A paper describes a structure:
Previous studies of the ligand binding domain of [name] demonstrated negative cooperativity between cAMP binding sites in the absence of structural change within this domain. We produce coarse-grained models that describe global low-frequency protein backbone motions of [name] and show a strong correlation between negative cooperativity for cAMP and modulation of the delocalised normal modes on ligand binding without a requirement for a spatially distinct physical pathway or conformational change. We demonstrate experimentally that altered connectivity between backbone elements in [name] can give predictable alterations to cooperativity for cAMP binding through altered mode amplitudes.
The removal (V132A) or addition ([name]) of a side chain methyl group of V132 was engineered to decrease and increase, respectively, the strength of hydrophobic interaction across the dimer interface. Computation predicted that these mutations would result in more negative and positive cooperativity in [name], respectively and that the most important contacts contributing to this effect were with L62 and V132 of the opposing monomer. High-resolution X-ray crystal structures of [name] mutants V132A and [name] demonstrated that these variants possessed decreased and increased hydrophobic interactions across the dimer interface, respectively. Comparison of variant crystal structures with wild-type demonstrated that there was no statistically significant change in structure. Cooperativity for cAMP binding was studied by isothermal titration calorimetry (ITC) for wild-type, V132A, and [name] proteins to examine whether the experimentally observed changes in cooperativity matched computational predictions. The qualitative computational prediction for altered cAMP cooperativity was tested experimentally including a significant controlled inversion of the sign of the cAMP cooperativity ([name]).
Numbering used by the authors:
A (entry chain A): 6 to 209
B (entry chain B): 9 to 209
């Protein structure tokens, strides 16, 4: 189901706010004191390497918590930027108020922690993929994963997505021009087709 | 610490010699662990069995937590004792009951999951754009940046073999060997013995 009494009980203690596409909701390095929850829309989580190249860590969607990593220890800073990808409606609540809720009904912490565990798995797998997959394998895996994001439109030949070469590069950790060359190959190999800011993935 | 005591008194604690596999990747997850004493390595590997260490965990760390929140999860990684270990253990089902009495125990587990997410994301962002040379270089450069470093005429000095490097980055032993040799021939490092001087800093 989309939601449930526990989530709605939780949401009743929150203020829900709207953000236009491309808003930065969370800035890296700032003090964390607030927990968020996506009621509609999607965001990208961003970090940088030591040279200041931007990497897209994750997409997060409706039903996902954000800003949860500061909850657990005093005086923590936001680990990453979070930017709207889509017009967003986002519930929000102070860590203070959320800690009470946790005592009232620990399941709400269970819900949150299920997401942190999944994130650690997913993020660990990407790490492994740096070393175990080659760049072509990583782009291809990325196309496969994008293909089952909840925003992926349906098509006679498989899932259609919309993403720039730039964005694919930032997800995988390679340049825009490398993505360019590789997509060209992939479709010349009739595994995908790519006309527009928009790509059809066969199978999925 | 009243809460850890309480939690431990509901576990069974066992001893494992250095080098035991505590957790096997792919196996069905139903049990939670907690390191009472000792250190462990958390590892993944490809179809060739190139290993990559995701992390070390130490005394006071939970392990095998990631299957707790959904039925029928498999273990995401191998976990291997690095020293001799004393490891407490508890069924997920009984850990769920403890969480009902005192959610603070889940606060402590989740705090660690958050620290691990932060560390692992950092490594990903820091390595993703590098090739295997970059990643071996940065690794060396980072040990020059830690406490275990001696000084030198030419720069910082470090101890570590080719296996150990292969693990930080994900690559074979022969590949590390080739790249250390290149780096040496390009006079960025010296391999005097099976230790390494990193020229700079
Ligand atoms: N590896 C990741 N995967 C998914 N989301 C993340 C990841 N790293 C950080 N975030 C999110 O981005 C947020 C940045 O602010 P916090 O660290 O408070 O909480 C963080 C998480 O909600
Ligand atoms: N990136 C990581 N950092 C630290 N520990 C991890 C990481 N990935 C997996 N683990 C630990 O390794 C365990 C393997 O079994 P589980 O997936 O049950 O729980 C996992 C975590 O306890």
């Amino acid at each position: 189901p989309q939601t449930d009494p526990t989530l709605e009980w939780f949401l009743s203690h929150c203020h829900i706010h709207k953000y236009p596409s491309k808003s930065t909701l969370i800035h890296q390095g700032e003090k964390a004191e607030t927990l968020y929850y996506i009621v509609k829309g999607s965001v990208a989580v961003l970090i940088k390497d030591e040279e200041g190249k931007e990497m897209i860590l994750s997409y997060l969607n409706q039903g996902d918590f954000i800003g949860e990593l500061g909850l657990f220890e005093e005086g923590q800073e936001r680990s990453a930027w979070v930017r709207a990808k889509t017009a967003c409606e986002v519930a929000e609540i102070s860590y203070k108020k959320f800690r009470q809720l946790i005592q009232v009904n620990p399941d709400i912490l269970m819900r949150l922690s299920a997401q942190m565990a999944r994130r650690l798995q997913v993020t660990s797998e990407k790490l492994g993929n740096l070393a175990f997959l080659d760049v072509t394998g990583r782009i291809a895996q990325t196309l496969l994963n994008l293909a089952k994001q909840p925003d992926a439109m349906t098509h006679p030949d498989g899932m259609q997505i919309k993403i720039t070469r730039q964005e694919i590069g930032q997800i995988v950790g390679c340049s825009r021009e490398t993505v360019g060359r590789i997509l060209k190959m992939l479709e010349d190999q009739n595994l995908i087709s790519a006309h527009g800011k928009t790509i059809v993935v066969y199978g999925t």
